[PDB]
């Protein structure tokens, strides 16, 4: 039911947003690879999880990403209902 138009951007959406965490860690008052697993984990409802953002602002980026997980997969499994 999901067209390839949305697939490409959402697939690349996680990659371009995970890097901002380590970028934000530069001026904080955990390598880049060790921080990217978090975002892909959030969406996939996975059981693998370790390491959390340390800076206060980095949590906000992780915070807003949490809401994106709930809206997509739940609504995606609502279109199939019809």
């Amino acid at each position: 039911p999901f067209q390839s138009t949305l697939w490409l951007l959402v697939g690349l959406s996680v990659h371009v947003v995970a890097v901002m965490l380590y970028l934000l860690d530069r001026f904080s008052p955990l390598t880049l690879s060790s921080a990217m697993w978090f975002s892909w984990g959030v969406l996939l409802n996975s059981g693998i999880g370790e390491g959390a953002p340390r800076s206060f602002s980095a949590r906000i980026l992780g915070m807003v990403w949490a809401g994106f997980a709930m809206i997509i997969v739940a609504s995606y499994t609502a279109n199939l209902a019809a």
Binding site: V17, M20, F27, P29, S57, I60, L61, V64
Partner: peptide, 19 residues
Amino acid sequence: AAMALSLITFISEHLFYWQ
């Protein structure tokens, strides 16, 4: 507005860090 909210809060800790 996510990063826009992040960048404006990015300098918020800079104020505490620099003062």
